Design a protein around this ligand. Structure first.
Ligand SMILES: *Cc1cc2c(cc1C)nc1c(=O)[nH]c(=O)nc-1n2C[C@H](O)[C@H](O)[C@H](O)COP(=O)(O)OP(=O)(O)OC[C@H]1O[C@@H](n2cnc3c(N)ncnc32)[C@H](O)[C@@H]1O
Ligand SMILES: Nc1nc(=O)c2nc(CNc3ccc(C(=O)N[C@@H](CCC(=O)O)C(=O)O)cc3)cnc2[nH]1
Ligand SMILES: Nc1nc(=O)c2nc(CNc3ccc(C(=O)N[C@@H](CCC(=O)O)C(=O)O)cc3)cnc2[nH]1
Ligand code: NA
Lengths: 828, 312, 104
């Protein structure tokens, strides 16, 4: 009744995963490692163990808090695997000092206690710091030092006691499969049978992935770590040989971190060129030869790369100038294109999962989430930033992984704005309108490889004619980054005239075949058995009722549906579900899923003059009688066949206009020319995001994740509880919006000017009770808007404070939508 | 009216354009249209090469009639295809995806080739009617067990496959269903041809394009300039190189990467006038003129493409 | 208003342009204006060079204020001027012709 599980890798991830599976009652597990069990020799076998919990990611922060809790609990002979010395990040620049105030906000948002320290308080906590340099610090008492190698040994001990088998000195050479599912793991000595294989192979993860034709987007890279000789100032203060009493220390302005090792210092440095590693050159280590200074994960130390770090270190901690470099190594770990880990089931092979590119800091959390996933079908923590299927195809090439992962290493400790783009690689994916957008001075930012206009410099000329009520207040330097007042003009023209938005990057799936309706009826919360032409907004839930995605479904014909979705997690979810239905079904149950985004395009043509515009270049009927709200029909515009869908993410009259990529520029040019007497503009993502917030339209991944049910999110209207069957129905029985303990709420900022950006903590009567999910300046309502979950007892009209860079901003819980709640602009 | 056979309409134009259209306009493309697609016949950028072209390549004067919708620039484009490296826009070539557990069965019955070959094989083959007349000559590339990409001659082919696929599906088992999609407008193709093609592509890819890496009339997936591509090794112009296919959203990047890589090799954009001359020099037949359903494969000189040993 | 010393007007713009303006736009020029002239401060085309630039040329992070109307691309442009060859648009440099028998 339990699946046969093989875990590849006895690092901190693989052993935690075995342990988390065992406590959930699954113990038919074989853990394999090419290294000796007593010291496997991957990255875990050299990690210094600094654990800093505070993180911009709610999920990553939760993983870290669990790792702290678990390692504190993991004990033998009265000694745990966590030394809770606390953690101190210091600032030596004004930029860094401001960012610590933001990180204090993350701490409160994610339920981690911490404090900002003055220079004097930093001295008191950490007297070795030369204070001349120090502008302030962030102190989190619950941070500390993991004993990762010891943890692995104690995890092996207790899982073995529970029946798990470990085979060290055992190299995986291939993966056996049949019928699209994993059947075993190949070694020199034969095949080990398996129903589930989890690759917990650390920086070997891409090599393992190649065994099944899976692209695992991590790059092995080396990072320097040095131990000093005994430091005179430290003489006699700590237990030898490896004690520590002071908080772990981050010096992000110089790309450095520190811990004590008895009276020596350990220095981790990212203050060097990126160092990509070719795993195929490491050589097979005979297990009998693996030792502390001789293991696959440790490359020869390159002293020349470390000299600037050593100088910076002596400047921060002058006591260290009276020591020398004792030992260093260049230690291999993994980086990914977006700095997130890689979790979940492979696209290529059923039952084959990854849990790779995971810091020691997050290890137990990743293991717990994966154990939940394997034993229940879902993680209790949102994996949207962690799932291997989040990546688009252009993001999975070896060249992209190498370039972006190297740049993430170069920027690892930099203060960066949430909208900061990469400067390369860029222009990978462009819509058919790209040349016209460049003529109009598009300011592009990128996501999923797509170049997306945020505003157009052509529209700067409109600011002088804009009514003063539309002109926003000045922004601060931070909220002003990757923002422009031109966005206000674009919102103005969308609300009063007509605008063309490039909706091409919206994930577009075609679901087709005699089983398409059946598949969608089971996966979504809508009754989709409607005549062709119906558009439905609906949810994909998991079996616990958590929101996997909100999608639009347009029935184009009896056996063809076009879906607007949220990304490649959705694509992979539909692909597997379609294949499973096809394999287990009849001749009338087959269904194909195609991601057609890159082959097609879409213009959102929205605004009160949209019908006036379109009427000039089409003879199809776009009146209410001709195309009703939330319906689709085929039309011809400017000679081009189009699928027109009547809905609007910005809340105005008009349509999403879809066509094939080869026709897009003509469709664009025809509408453009027709729109001249109506003052048509191109409009970008900054205005779009503001306008959709003014409508209260939710954005999956921030405003709701699988951690929320539809009722908490305010999306009850989208769930048809009368349906006979759908995924999540049983979980949602009896639930309502009014009785939800947490509810998504709209906040408006009282002072009309203090814009927030996302993740800021939200306080009610001085208690942290939520955090900003989505935010924007509302140009129509002329004030900043922010969404947050809040306890159900907090009501519309109540006041809350949002903390932004350490300052409390008063906001009011406000009824949504903020704009046009009677839908007068959308209807009739 | 007296009209030349290549006379274009002046409107409507610019209905369908490939992903390379802005780059083609930068290069002074002279476009003519077919099936709605704007197709470069030559590029004014290449007029600058005429002064450096060896005299043996310079053609005689044309008469007013044969000179209509023709340019001596085409001679330079042919020259560079034969001696250097050129980028042709193959996007308008009819492109069909035939997929499903019945795809192989369908293609085995409709074509003159034994297509039961491991994925990666490209086959030039014929579609006949029951009298042996040539309906079309096509290329079939097996991309995976149940996915084939066809290069065809137009929408008569698309409709023929659509109905045949539907009939097989309706009358067949759970393992006989097959879908046909005309993917031309959603994708694009550069023909990268000429003796310096391997030198060029090697600068922007780490995949192996040697003979060992990709054999003649085979296909494989590669990455060029960051873009996932399906590369097929064949050439309508008779030179080294490949048809490089990708999704429309990736096309301009693929174009720009190859363009930049090709600068030290004298890469040019090359248009349909040179292409048509070069393919004639190879004896490659054009369906609808060189053969129709009035001709059998043997009359057309395409006997090599008919596997008479096939069961059916 | 609090304004950075390099803050441009958003209108009127594009009053005076050099003969190279279309080529500069192809190359992703970031323009600022003085005396009516549109002047490139750097070119987005050159962002692709940052990955190949020797580390000694890569500058430290800037603060938000010094980072306004600045880009790391400028480091690559300086690098290539010092090690290769670069084309600067000197068109806006005030140019006077003084002529006649009394000019000297
Ligand atoms: C290198 C490094 C890492 C590091 C650090 C400092 C250095 C120089 N400092 C850290 C810090 O203070 N805080 C922190 O949170 N992490 C820090 N790290 C990163 C950390 O070491 C790694 O992220 C973590 O240890 C990764 O753990 P994971 O369990 O994922 O990986 P692993 O220890 O490398 O184990 C993988 C095992 O897989 C086996 N393997 C690989 N291929 C095979 C095959 N084919 N067959 C059988 N076994 C295989 C390996 O042998 C290895 O043991
Ligand atoms: N592309 C796209 N994707 C979306 O997710 C999306 N979401 C919204 C916001 N959500 C929605 C959802 C439902 C209705 C709505 O009025 N549903 C009505 C109408 C259904 C009908 O008349 O058929 C309802 O009564 O449930 C409007 C906006 C707007 N545009 C979008 N556009
Ligand atoms: N896109 C495209 N479509 C075509 O119709 C086309 N046709 C030709 C001209 N015809 C062909 C046909 C067969 C062979 C050929 O050499 N067939 C060999 C090789 C087969 C193999 O090695 O697998 C044979 O032995 O039959 C070459 C050109 C060239 N390029 C094209 N390219
Ligand atoms: Na750095």
């Amino acid at each position: 009744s339990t699946p046969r599980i093989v875990i590849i890798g006895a690092g901190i991830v693989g052993t935690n995963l075995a342990d988390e599976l065992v406590t959930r009652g699954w113990n038919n597990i074989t853990v394999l490692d090419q290294g000796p069990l007593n010291m496997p020799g991957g990255s875990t076998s050299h990690a210094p163990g600094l654990v800093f919990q505070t993180n911009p990611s709610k999920t990553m922060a939760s993983f870290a808090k669990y790792t702290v809790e678990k390692l504190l609990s993991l004990t033998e002979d009265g000694v745990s695997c966590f030394n809770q010395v606390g953690g101190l990040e210091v600032a030596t620049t004004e930029t860094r000092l401001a960012d610590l105030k933001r990180k204090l906000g993350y701490a409160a948002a994610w339920g981690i206690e911490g404090r900002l320290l003055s220079p004097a308080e930093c001295q008191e906590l950490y007297p070795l710091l030369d204070g001349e340099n120090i502008l302030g610090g962030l102190h989190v008492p619950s941070d500390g030092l993991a004993s990762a190698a010891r943890a692995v040994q104690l995890l092996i001990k207790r899982t073995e006691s529970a029946g798990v088998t470990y085979r060290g000195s055992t190299t995986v050479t291939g993966i056996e499969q049949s019928g699209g599912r994993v059947t075993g793991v190949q070694t020199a000595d034969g095949v080990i049978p398996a129903d589930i294989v989890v690759s917990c192979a650390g920086f070997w993860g891409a090599k393992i992935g190649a065994m099944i034709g899976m692209a695992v987007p991590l790059l092995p890279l080396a990072h320097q770590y040095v131990k000093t000789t005994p430091v005179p100032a430290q003489q006699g203060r700590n237990d030898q040989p490896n004690g520590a009493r002071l908080p772990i220390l981050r010096h992000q302005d110089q790309d450095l971190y520190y811990r004590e090792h008895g009276d020596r210092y350990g220095i981790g440095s990212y203050a060097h060129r990126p160092m990509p590693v070719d795993v195929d050159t490491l050589g097979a280590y005979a297990p009998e030869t693996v030792s502390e200074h001789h293991m696959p994960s440790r490359l020869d130390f390159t002293l020349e790369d470390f000299l600037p770090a050593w100088e910076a270190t002596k400047q921060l901690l002058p006591a260290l100038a009276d020591s020398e470099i004792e030992d260093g190594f260049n230690g291999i770990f993994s980086f990914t294109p977006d700095g997130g880990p890689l979790l979940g089931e492979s696209k290529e092979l059923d039952g084959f999962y990854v849990a790779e590119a995971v810091w020691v800091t997050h290890s137990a959390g990743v293991a717990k989430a994966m154990a939940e996933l394997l034993t229940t079908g879902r993680s209790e923590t949102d994996l949207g930033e962690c799932d291997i299927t989040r990546f688009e195809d252009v993001q999975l090439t070896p060249e992209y992984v190498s370039e972006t992962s190297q740049q993430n290493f170069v920027e690892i400790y930099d203060v960066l704005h949430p909208l900061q783009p990469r400067l390369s690689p860029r222009n990978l994916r462009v819509s058919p309108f790209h040349a016209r957008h460049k003529e109009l001075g598009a300011f592009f930012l990128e996501a999923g490889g797509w170049e997306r206009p945020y505003w157009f410099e052509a529209n700067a000329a409109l600011l002088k004619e804009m009514p003063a009520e539309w002109l926003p207040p000045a922004r601060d330097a931070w909220s002003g980054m990757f923002s422009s007042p031109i966005a206000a003009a674009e919102a103005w023209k969308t609300r009063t005239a007509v605008a063309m938005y490039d909706m091409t990057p919206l994930k577009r799936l075609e679901v087709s075949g005699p089983g398409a309706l059946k598949l969608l009826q089971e996966l979504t919360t809508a009754d989709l058995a409607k005549k062709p032409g119906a558009v439905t907004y609906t949810l994909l839930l998991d079996h616990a009722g958590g929101v996997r995605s909100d999608i639009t479904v347009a029935r184009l014909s009896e056996d063809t549906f076009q879906l607007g979705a949220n990304g490649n997690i959705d694509t992979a979810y539909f692909e597997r579900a379609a294949r499973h239905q096809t394999q287990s079904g009849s001749a009338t149950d087959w269904v194909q899923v195609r991601d057609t985004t890159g082959g097609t395009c879409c213009i959102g043509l929205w605004g009160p003059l949209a019908r006036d515009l379109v009427s000039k270049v089409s003879d199809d009927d776009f009146t209410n009688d001709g195309l009703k709200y939330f319906r689709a029909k085929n039309v011809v515009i400017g000679g081009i066949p189009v699928t027109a869908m009547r809905l609007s993410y910005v809340g105005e009259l008009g349509w999403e206009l879809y066509t094939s990529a080869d026709n897009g520029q003509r469709l664009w040019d025809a509408l453009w020319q027709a729109g001249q007497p109506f003052g048509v503009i191109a409009a970008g993502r900054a205005a779009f995001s503001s306008l959709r917030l003014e409508k209260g339209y939710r954005s999956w991944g921030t405003d709701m994740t699988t951690e929320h049910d539809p009722f908490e999110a305010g999306l009850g209207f989208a769930v048809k509880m009368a349906k006979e069957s759908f995924i999540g129905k049983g979980a949602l029985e009896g639930r309502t919006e009014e009785a939800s303990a947490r509810r998504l709420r709209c906040l408006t900022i009282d002072d009309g000017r203090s814009i927030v950006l996302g993740k800021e903590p939200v306080f009610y009567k001085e208690q942290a009770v939520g955090y900003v999910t989505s935010a924007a300046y509302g140009y129509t309502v002329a004030k900043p808007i922010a969404y947050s979950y809040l306890p159900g007892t907090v009501s519309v009209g109540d006041s809350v404070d949002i903390e932004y860079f350490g300052r409390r901003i008063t906001a009011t819980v406000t009824e949504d939508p903020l704009y046009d709640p009677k839908m007068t602009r959308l209807r009739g």
